[model samples]
Target: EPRAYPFNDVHGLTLAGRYGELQETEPVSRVRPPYGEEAWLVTRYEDVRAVLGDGRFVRGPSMTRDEPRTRPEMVKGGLLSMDPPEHSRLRRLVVKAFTARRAESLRPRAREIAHELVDQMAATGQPADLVAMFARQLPVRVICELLGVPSADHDRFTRWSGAFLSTAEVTAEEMQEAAEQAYAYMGDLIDRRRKEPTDDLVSALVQARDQQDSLSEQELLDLAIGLLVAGYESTTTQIADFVYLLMTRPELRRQLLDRPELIPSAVEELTRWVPLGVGTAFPRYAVEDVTLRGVTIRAGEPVLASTGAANRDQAQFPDADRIDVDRTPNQHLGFGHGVHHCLGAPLARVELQVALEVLLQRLPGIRLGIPETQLRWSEGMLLRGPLELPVVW
Candidate 1:
C-alpha cells in the first residue's frame, strides 16, 4: 500500500512521524504525493543511499510531465531535471564558478554581511523575528552578490523565485508570470554580461555560451535562474532551523558557547540531523529494473529517497536520532548523494558557520523571545522551518 508521500509535521521542526516506522518496518515502500504519481519511498539509510547513487535509477527516464511533484503543475527544467552527458554538459559549463577560490573569497563576505545583519538586529534591540532580521537577509545578500546580480534586483528575484519554489502559496497563473519575469530579468542580465563581462558566474556562463557555444540561450537562462534560486531557499531555512535547535536546547548551546571550536562539527552534525526539505527530494526515475532488499523497482518507476529518514537510520549512524555536535565519521545524505550533490555546498557551509558564529558571539544571552508553545512552523510546499523565530537577548 502506498502511504501518502511526505508526511510533514504541522506543529514544528520535527519530521513526519511515519518515516521512522517505515524505516524500521518497510525500508522500501510505495508513496504518492497528493498531486502526482506514486513512487517508491526508500527510507533506510542504505536503501536511500542506493536509490540515490545507483546508475540504473536516474532523472531523465520515466518523467511523464505529470509525475511526482510538490507544485500543482509539473516542472520540466533546470539542472535537477536532466541527467548524464546532458546533465554533465550543463554542469561542466559552470563548475569552474564553484572552485576553492570562490569559497575562500566568499567566506569573508558572508561574515561581513553576518555582522551587518547582527548590527541591525542589535539596533532593533531584543524581541526580533530572526527569520526576517537575520536568516533571510544573510543568504539573499550573499547569493545575490556572488551571482553578480545587483542589489537593486534582490527583491525582484526573491519574489519571482518563490513563485517557482512555492507549493500552494501561489496560483499557476502567477507562477507563469514569475517564469516570464525571471526570464526577462535573466535576458537583460545576460545581455549586460555579454557587452561587459565581470567576475561572476553569469559572466562566466556567458563567456562559455558565446565563445564555445556550449549552452542554448534557454539553457543559459535556466542555469542562471536555477542556481540563484537554489542558494537562498534551503540555506535560509537551514540557518533559521539550526539556530532554533540551538536556542531551544539550553545544555546543547552552553556546550557550544563554552567551546566554540565545536561550531564546525556542530554544523555538520546538525546538517545530518535536520530534515532539510518539507517532503521528497526531486524524484529519480529508474531507467531499468533495480532491485534492493528483495524489492524491485521496475523500469520507468519513480523513487524518492528520504534523506531525513536515512539520516536517522541507526544502521548508518549509531545513536542517530540524538544530536551529537561532535559526531565523527558522519557521511549523512543531508546534501543528497552522487551526481546531483549540492553545487552551492561550499558557500552554504560558510554561510551557516559564519551566521551561527556571529550570532552567538555578538548577541550575548540570546534566547527565544517567546515560549516554545508560540513558535510556529512555516511550510512552503517544499521547504520547512520555524515560521518566525522570536528572539531576545
Candidate 2:
C-alpha cells in the first residue's frame, strides 16, 4: 500500500523557500500535509495584507471547542489572532493602554534599564553573558513592572515564558500546564488591580472595565497575558539578536556609534533582518476560495505569511541580504501590516532604539567574547535568538 502523502522536512529554514516558491508561482497553493495539517501558506506581501485584513478569516475557531483543532494549547485568540468586528473591539480597548504616547513615555525608563543591565555586566569586569546580564533582564524587568507583574517573581516568569515560546518542542500536556500556570498568575495580578488599583497599564485596563463597561473578564485576562508575553519575550529575543548582529558587523556598529541620529532607521533594518517569533504569524486559514497574484487557494487550508522571507525577497529589495541601515521606502513587514499588525510595535521600536544606542555607546569597546559560529541560538522550531551571548567591553 502506498501512502497518501510523503513526509517533508519541517525542521530547517527551507520552509521559507517552500513558502516563497508557492507565493511566486501561484496566488495560493495547496501544501500537502505531515508537513503540516493541510494548509495554504500565504507568501507575497500584498496577499498577506489582503488575507489578514479580510473578515472571512476568523482568528480562533480552535479555542471555541477544546478538541485540539490545530494543535492543543497552541494558536489561541489573544488580540493578535482575533478577527473583526470582535477583533476590532478588543484591539481598540487594548490599544488605549499601549498608545504611542504611553510607549514613548517608557523610553526614559527603558534607557535606565539598559544602563543598569550594562552596569551589572561591568561589575563582573570585562567579559560577561549579555544574554543573562542585558538581553533577557532589561526588557523583562521593564515590561514586568509596566504590566504590574511583581518584580520579586521575575525568576518564575522568566522560566515559564521561556518554556512558553518553545511549546512546539514540548508535549501538549506540558504546554497546557505552563499556560494554565502563566494565565493564573496574570489573572491574579488582574484581580489585585481590580480591588486596589495602580497606575500601570494592566491596572488601568482592569479599572477601565468598571468605568466604561467595555471589556469582559476573559478579554482582560487575554490582553494582560498577551501584553506580558509580548513585553517580555519578543523584545528580549530581538535585543539579543540585534546586539549580536551589531557586534558581528563592526562597520555598522562604528557607523551607529559615530552618528546616533541614524539609530531609528537602523532599528527598522535590524527588525527586518532578525525577524523574531516562530512559525510565521500564527497560521492563518483561507475562509473562501480566492485567487491571489494569479495562484488559486482552495477554501479551508491554513496560510502563513513568511515575513522573514518577504523582507529578504531579492525582487522586492536590492541586495537584500546586506544590512543597509539607510535603506528607504523599506515599508518592510517587520511589525507586520494591516489590522493584525503587532500591537506592541511602538513600545518595541522605543525599546530597540534605546537599547541599541545605549549598548553601543557605553560599551564602545564591546566585542563578542565568542566567535560567531560558537554562539548558540535558542533551540526550538519557532522563536529565534541566542541562548547565551557572551560579549566583552
Candidate 3:
C-alpha cells in the first residue's frame, strides 16, 4: 500500500523515522499525497539529486495539469513552476539582480539590522520571543531594503507571506484572499515604478519589462510578489529553527560560542540536520520514461525528492545524523538543486551567518526562555518552526 505522504511530528528537527526506513528498503517508492495523485518519493542522496537535476523530470507540465500538490489550493504559477526556455527566459531577465555582488552589497545593512533587533530585544528585556523580535525581523527588513518597499508596509507583507505558507492551518479561501490582496499591492507598486524607477529590484524589473518588452505584465506582477514572499518566509523559519537547535543542544551551542570560526560550517551542518518543510515541495513529472534504482517511471509520473532524507543518507555523509560543526565538503541539498534551485540561497547564507554571529556575539549567555518540553512547534504549516522561541541572555 502507498503510505500517506509526508509523515511528520512537528515538535523538533527530526524527520519521521519512516523516511530512513524507506531509504534503506526502497529508495524509490510510492506514496499518496494529501491531495491529487499518488507519486514517487525519492529518498537516497544520489537519487534525489538525479531526479531533481534531470531535465527529463520537468516542472512545466505540472503547471498545466492538476498537480499532485501539498495544498488544496493550486498555487498561482510563478517562476518556480516554469521549466526551461520560459523558465530560463524569466530567470535570465532577473538573474543580474541577485548576483553575489548585489547580495554582498546588503551585508552591512543586514549586520546593522541584526544589531538593532538585538538592541530591541535588550530594551524589551529577557523572556523575549526570538521568532518575533529577532529571527522574524531581520529577513523582512532586508527584503524591504532590497525591494524598496516602505517600512510602514512591513506588517502587511508579513501577514500575506505567513498566509502563503500555511498548508493546513488556513482554508483555501483565506489563502486566495491574501493572494489577491498581495497581488493588488504589487500591481500598485509596479504602477508607481512605471512612472518613476528607482535603484531597487521592482524598479529594475519594471524597466526590464518596459525597455526590452521581454517580460509580460502578468509575469512582472507575479515575479514581484514571489520575490517578496520567497525572500522572507524560509529564512525566518530557519533562523528560529536553528536557534531552537542551538538552545537545546549544549554541545553545539558551546562550540559556536567558544569557537565562533566554526559557525560558517555549522550553518551548512544545521541546514542539513534540520528540514525546512515536513516533506518536499513541487514534485517533478517524468517527461519521458526514466528508470531510477530498479523501477521505471512512465512519462507523466511525478516524483518527490525527500531532501531531508537524502541529507541523512550515511552513504553520502559518515555518521550523517551527527552534527559535526566543522564538517567539510558538505554538499547538502538544503537550497535544493537544478533549474529551480533557490534564487535567494546565497542571500540567505549571508543572512543566516550574520544573524548567528550577531545573536551569539550580543548575548553569549543566550538560551531558551522556557524548558524545551514547554516549547510548541507550529502545526499544519508548510514549514517546520517553533511558533515562538522565548529566549533569555
- Using lDDT as the measure, which candidate wins? 3
Report how far off residue 263 is in candidate 1 (Å). 1.9
Each candidate's lDDT (Cα)? 0.80, 0.70, 0.83
- Model 1 is weakest, by summed lDDT over 10 consecutive residues, at 159-168
Quote the positional error of residue 257 for candidate 2 in Å: 0.5
Give the CA lDDT, 0 to 100, for residue 242 in model 3.
87
Model 2 spans with C-alpha error above 4 angstroms:
1-27, 30-35, 62-75, 150-163, 167-185, 209-212
Task: Estimate the TM-score of every prediction.
Answer: 0.91, 0.84, 0.92
Better of 2 and 3 by lDDT: 3
lDDT of 3 by residue, 1-393 (tens): 989987777677778889889889988999987787898889999999998899898887776777665667676577878889878878877776556777777888899989989999999899999987887778878887777777789678767766765532688798888889888988888789878888777787766642354566787787877787787878988999988888888999899999988888999999998877876778899989998888999999888888889988889989998989888789999989998888888788889989889999998889988988888888744788988899999
- The residue ranges of model 3 lying beyond 4 angstroms of the native Cα positions read 152-156, 159-181, 208-213
What does candidate 1's lDDT look like per residue over 1-393, in tens digits? 788766876457676779888888888899878777888888898888877888787887534545775667565667787788778877777776556578657888789889988888888877989988888778877877777888788778766766654432787698889889888988888889878999977787777642364666777787777876788778888999899898989877898899889988899999999887778768888888888778988988888888888888888899888899899899988888888888888788888989889988887588999998878777566777877888998
Error of 1 at 4 (Å): 2.6
Clashing pairs in 1: none
**Model 1 has how many clashing residue pairs?**
0
RMSD of each: 2.5, 4.2, 2.5
